[PDB]
Write a protein that binds this ligand. Structure first.
Ligand SMILES: Nc1ncnc2c1ncn2[C@H]1C[C@H](O)[C@@H](COP(=O)(O)OP(=O)(O)OP(=O)(O)O)O1
Ligand SMILES: Nc1ncnc2c1ncn2[C@H]1C[C@H](O)[C@@H](COP(=O)(O)OP(=O)(O)OP(=O)(O)O)O1
Ligand SMILES: Nc1ncnc2c1ncn2[C@H]1C[C@H](O)[C@@H](COP(=O)(O)OP(=O)(O)OP(=O)(O)O)O1
Ligand SMILES: Nc1ncnc2c1ncn2[C@H]1C[C@H](O)[C@@H](COP(=O)(O)OP(=O)(O)OP(=O)(O)O)O1
Ligand SMILES: [Mg+2]
Ligand SMILES: [Mg+2]
Ligand SMILES: [Mg+2]
Ligand SMILES: [Mg+2]
Ligand SMILES: [Mg+2]
Ligand SMILES: [Mg+2]
Lengths: 480, 481, 481, 480
């Protein structure tokens, strides 16, 4: 029968036996050894938390919302079967994450396997399939009134979207709102965010501005374009803008911390240098690399943060280079942050250009006296796309509301109906430059290149420009 | 006398110097125990029972924290215990001038009861401070602890209200310019008063505070700027500061300007107006004052608190029947009814002198809709709310100085474009709320029609629920749909 | 009417059924906004601004949570919405009877002002409930929502006060026995009222609460015990229950019985006694009552709140000079002075009838020490405080039923010896505090000598600072050293 | 180098002196990032992801707070920056010696793997400290900041472990006696280590901490006691101290000794024992050690962390099949089954030498009941847990000195009878938990009968569920 778990974020959470069964598998328990925030623990020591607990919380919130909708509106005809499918999807959407979470799919795979297109979402689905099959979960699903054919499909669609008009098969348009819960492809407002806001804040020691419980109390389902969608009370629109403001602020302060990112980068580099020599045993004894473990779920199951220590503790001279990089992390001899800047006006930077940017910085020729001359390979340039989840688009334009005088009647609210104190744009890029040569003279030089390059490209003046490169900044009129 | 410890839920165990205790244990200060921080907000947010008293302790303590932190980081500043105590006293004493229900008193009631006079709680804080000192022989005690009342009383007053009339301050020289930035920062609004109320109001409202003042105190340094010594913030903390103001604005949107909170303020104000002629408060020499004239005698002002509300509610005098009746409608929750919200468009701005005429404009609107009842100007209330980042149209971060880690003594400026594109383009706006004093279904239905029609007439923004409440009006306007 | 949401800092967003709202929006309920939960504690713990009103919402909500949880876990209980609403109304309404400064009123002032009468805030809660219903036509609304006023009003009153006179309850049958355990558990004191105040008082005092009521609700089941259906707790949660009472006792030790908190209560009480003859409160039909007689007319009681304190403080009537003077000494913090604390020894226990004679005993002690001043009985205050786990000498866990996971429908009992040896051997005790009304150094020096001598004479426990305050006295007693 | 700021969720922004940073940025310290504070507790309390690393920062910081506060209140103490840094370093470094899964290592695994040796994490903290200093050239840096390595290294070690053998300390004189009370108080256990873990563990477990260390720091003074200068507490704070220990005991009851938490510790231990012969860790000079012998070489110990658990779990070596199999049963949550709890009666106490024989006693019990299966000693596990207030049968408040406001410089003593009758009469006890390795319904049914019978045979306390679990057995005993 049902279990109770004490979670510091949510208190006592009840788990249905079916969910317990899913949880007590190697594929799920693997998430215990994967840090939610990856390299962020190396900056924010409270951030020891792993994907496992986050996943329970997501499962629980998914349950809270679907339950609340069913209580408020019986006409929806939400079944226990629906509830469990939504919960399982909530529990299982993080299944696909790799070592150090976003470091894996954000940095390492793109560089190690550039041709392949891969996301932790893709992986969550494959791992789910693997989990089910390796553990005879299908019978248990039937025992609790689930129909594996339909429901497994439903659960996967919740995580990844349509597997291919109504494009979903797992449930009909009348249950369209169930898709908005775990992973909302329309506007990003889902229970996953709500868990991580609260859980990350509790651990980082930052405080969360967003009340998900309030939002759940005001959520209704209404008809919109012959779909039944989740609608929010009109007056809660400010709170939603704040939700995304909060999300952006958490990225600025924590998830994109300049040092957090460089640590991610260093770990990535070490993984690249270990990739040829590290072997992980997949299906039938067969052997995979860190970069190919994504092709066999049996191998992927064993790919966790542990890899980092396997490398750190290795004695194989093949891994000397990789191991050396991790040692510099332990001694805190890190690549050195040089500065930050942004593009100007319409200028935007594409992914294909990323590899050429170190070369551009090294090519800048500042009119200054330098001991050392620096090369492209000495520079790291991290480009960070900050948005409200939908590139240039405003996600509140993709949200439906209702008012208290007509609760069944969905409506739209424009930005101009809310406030003038809101953002005019919803996307931007940050450029961080770091130097792999750490000494005073290399660093002094690196700053001159950097600031010169900013001036050459008509980027924004680094905040400390006048202090670090006083001989460069005067040339640019706009800057002073 | 030696030092006392107080347990505050926001700040933990706070130490108080005997001098501060002496100031605190006076009728003038203890009066703050009977003045709600958020006034009518308690009638919407039941956790908001807190009073100005505790807020004032917290402000005093944070003032102390920041000045102490600057002195520890930089001895060369030559900050004395005398400076520390003066800053703390100013922190404790900047809320001394508040009246019943806080901002309701100076924001609503006085402007309507004594329209000719110009008055602010800041003014009052200074007069009440003067009164407190004199009525309790505090000056001797100040001397006993190494303060110089001539200079220091001036300093403390300037901290609260600004110059009492280059360098316009007398209480301290330009080398101690940064001490003025602490309790009430007239330059950019970044001060310890905000920090206390953010944390304290959030803890009570059950909303969560986004702003880390402790972090800010760790990164604060003093640097030279324009031959002044000013408090400077680490460059990379600039985002946090934008967030501080974003937080402040969000607290106003959710709580301090809650539509119902405001109407309750308004109703209490109305009741006070109707009681003003009959309520008498004994000031200096047995002389008698009204609620609206108590501000002229600090002895009378000392006795003017939230208690007035219950004095009226519990009165039996038939003179007060009308005032008393209004408070009773509050208890029964028969409140004036919110009709809707809208904003001006483009450059349009609304001045204070026009406020009285707006109910008349709404009543004059003639919507092409079937109405049982016809409504009059006096049936409508129109609240106009100026929301900003503390400096009207100005960006306060343009008035902040920073430093970088490579040159910690060298002050610098950071522009908005150097921070983010996701920041606001404007830093002030107005909200218009309309409420109706006639509560029945038909009067309310009607009121919505006038309101939306009037929005259309004035080219204001489409109320969010416009199409639902006034479906026959909204189509006429192209822009709206 | 449809349902309302209220944001509480302790519990978050609480939903209120329209019927509850209607009850809430009355003068009789709204009155609780002007009664401090902790009375004079605010004068020691400045975060404790909270009033009975918000506590009452929280109790109402928790009552709802538990009854809902039982119904979800066991449908066979047949719990109806009707039952749910009755339990919630009882939760909301059990604090209705509290007077100014809460426990100060029924604990101190009434006993001394009307010694013949027997009165408790529970009594008052019932009378005020009756009054609230009748004065506001609530009965019709109850019927509209499917309640049966005859049965249900009785049920609600029984929840608050117990049987109005076996199955001694009329409002519901033995099969719904467990509904009585929720709001005010007369059997063992484990109820949702405690759970609210633990969390709410901690949040405000700035002390941290050790007890997880949410956990307890998850584990709670109903089982048959002695042909009753009672709420049962999971066996392994027994430690948590012992901790619940430990926490309750610690909150009293640190806060509710703070020595200075208590003396302030005492000073306010004294001021009320001296004002009682001159303060008049208009009850039913214009008839006039005193502070001490307002309890006889609910219409008058409705207007009796903390406001009285300020009515006196701000009075000009020379009749009230003495009462007013006492409150002024509170504002200036010239308080009666704590002398010390001690406890009885062995079997010795002190009865209420002896309380009046104790100041006289202390004044009669004759310490072999040199004294400037000689002190009188009237100079001494002696507060006696009974600390227990809610059931005098009895252990409340002996009155709790449990279940185990292998047989969830089978109730069982757990003895102390089955839990831990580290638990208390006794569950009740008395503290004696002595204070002096003469505050000067020499009177205080003397008062300490009397006090410690008296402790020695009566074979009480050695005050913790006995050797330091009165070195010349403590040597005489062998046991002490 | 200048000072760093770290954001800790428990304590906020903590400042670190450059010297402490230097100590922290070493492999020997960074190792603590891969050792769970609560070991197997994370497998019961999913918020408890935290590691020894962050606990250590918090201890270091609180040590600093207290010593600073004493110096501010009393200059006459003559506390120097040198003293402050030494106390902080001791605070940071007292957890250095902990092994995989913390107390599981020294509480369970070593005692069973190397029974002849006597070893504690305290011993290890000292050896690891020595190793850390030497391997990283910290001594020069100590001198640079005004420390005297000869005296101060000794001082720091004495803080952690006590005298290395009248005044028995060499690192500082009797006039600075109170500095020893801070990091690890051998007199009464009131130290900053507790204060950190109370607050940190509670934050993570989702239990709430009853004890206000900040308050205690405000009221702490130094007074003369028996020609020593000792830390004294304000008289009226005595209740808070009793509550401190009550809180400590309640944390053990709820969390640190959770029945399932403990069985998981036991299972991990068992797996480590079965792996001990085959796992090799490279120590000094390429030399090879076992899990159980790594404690003899700090270079090897540095590499011994929670990672071992995954090294075994992911192993393919058939030598480790048995060890690996145990960890897999943990992942599937096929755990040994808790049977019940009981305590000894009266004066009866159980010694460590008898522990091995208890499974045999339970198996020897012969209940008058019908059984399908007969169970053996090896099928039973018996955990014995000694609960106290930190000083066996002794009351630690009897070893605390107080002062009063009237005479602040005058130390005094307070007896229990001067405080309350509602306090405990005893300050120590034992708990016995019995578990069964055979998990099926019939084995478990049987195990309960043995257990309860055995309790009756030994005149132990009646298990709380005795009547439900073993109704036939329970009636024979009159007392029950
Ligand atoms: N006293 C407590 N207070 C708070 N949390 C607790 C307490 N005891 C245990 N927990 C946590 C640890 C677990 O995450 C969760 C459930 O544990 P627990 O109730 O002990 O379940 P269990 O599975 O060990 O017992 P059983 O299987 O006998 O029902 O609650
Ligand atoms: N046990 C406690 N835990 C937490 N806070 C407390 C406790 N006792 C008192 N406080 C709070 C209440 C007050 O705001 C503040 C000062 O209390 P306290 O130290 O009792 O001052 P006091 O003036 O009564 O004692 P004294 O004057 O004897 O030193 O600390
Ligand atoms: N944005 C917010 N965040 C948190 N709490 C809020 C917010 N807005 C209001 N509250 C609080 C104040 C109240 O205690 C409770 C209900 O308020 P609110 O949702 O504003 O109801 P309302 O009665 O004013 O609106 P309506 O009657 O139009 O639904 O929530
Ligand atoms: N905005 C923030 N709010 C709260 N904590 C933060 C914030 N940004 C960073 N932190 C945390 C992460 C670290 O634990 C700690 C210090 O980080 P930070 O001040 O960025 O130092 P840094 O070393 O990266 O910058 P620098 O070396 O330039 O001073 O505070
Ligand atoms: Mg997502
Ligand atoms: Mg005192
Ligand atoms: Mg201001
Ligand atoms: Mg009770
Ligand atoms: Mg740095
Ligand atoms: Mg210890």
């Amino acid at each position: 029968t049902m279990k109770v778990i004490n979670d510091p974020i949510h208190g006592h959470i009840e788990l249905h036996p079916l969910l317990v069964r899913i949880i007590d598998t190697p594929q799920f328990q693997r998430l215990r050894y994967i840090k939610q925030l990856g390299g962020g623990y190396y900056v924010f020591p409270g951030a020891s938390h792993n994907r496992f607990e986050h996943s329970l919380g997501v499962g629980y919130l998914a349950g809270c919302l679907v339950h609340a909708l069913g209580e408020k509106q019986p006409e929806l005809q939400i079944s226990e079967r629906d509830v469990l499918c939504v919960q399982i999807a909530g529990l299982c959407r993080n299944l696909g994450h790799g070592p150090f979470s976003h470091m894996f799919d954000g940095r390492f795979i793109p560089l190690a396997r550039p041709e392949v297109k891969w996301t932790h979402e893709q992986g969550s689905v494959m791992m789910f399939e693997h989990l089910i099959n390796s553990n005879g979960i299908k019978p248990v699903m039937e025992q609790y009134g689930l129909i594996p054919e339909e429901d497994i499909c439903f659960i996967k669609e919740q995580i990844v979207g349509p597997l291919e008009l109504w494009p979903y098969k797992g449930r009909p348009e009348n249950k369209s709102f169930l898709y908005e819960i775990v992973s909302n492809k329309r506007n990003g407002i889902d229970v996953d965010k709500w868990d991580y806001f609260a859980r990350d804040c509790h651990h980082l020691g930052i405080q969360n501005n967003f009340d998900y419980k309030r939002f759940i109390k005001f959520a209704r389902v209404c008809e919109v374009d012959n779909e039944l969608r989740i609608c929010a009370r009109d007056k809660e629109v400010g709170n939603l803008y704040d939700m995304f403001h909060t999300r952006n602020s958490l990225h600025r302060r924590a998830y994109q911390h300049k040092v957090g990112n460089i640590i991610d980068t260093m770990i990535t580099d070490a993984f690249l240098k270990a990739d040829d020599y590290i072997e992980i045993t997949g299906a039938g004894g067969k052997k995979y690399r860190i970069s190919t473990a994504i092709d066999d779920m049996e191998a992927y199951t064993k790919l966790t943060d542990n890899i980092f220590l396997e490398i750190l503790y290795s004695t194989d001279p093949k891994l000397k280079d990789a191991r050396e990089i991790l040692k510099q992390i332990e001694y805190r001899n890190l690549f050195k942050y040089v500065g930050e800047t942004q593009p100007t006006g319409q200028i935007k930077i594409k992914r294909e250009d990323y590899e050429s940017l170190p070369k551009e910085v090294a090519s800048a020729k500042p009119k200054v006296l330098l001991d050392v001359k620096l090369k492209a390979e000495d520079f790291i340039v991290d480009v960070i796309n900050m948005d409200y989840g939908m590139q240039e688009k405003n996600p509140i334009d993709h949200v439906s509301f209702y008012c208290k005088t007509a609760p069944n009647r969905a409506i739209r609210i424009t930005k101009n109906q809310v406030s003038q104190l809101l953002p005019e744009k919803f996307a931007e890029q940050l450029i961080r430059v770091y130097c792999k040569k750490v000494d005073r003279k290399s660093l002094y030089a690196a700053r001159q290149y950097f600031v010169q390059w900013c001036a050459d490209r008509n980027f924004t003046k680094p905040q400390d420009g006048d202090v670090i490169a006083p001989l460069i900044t005067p040339q640019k009129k706009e800057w002073n």
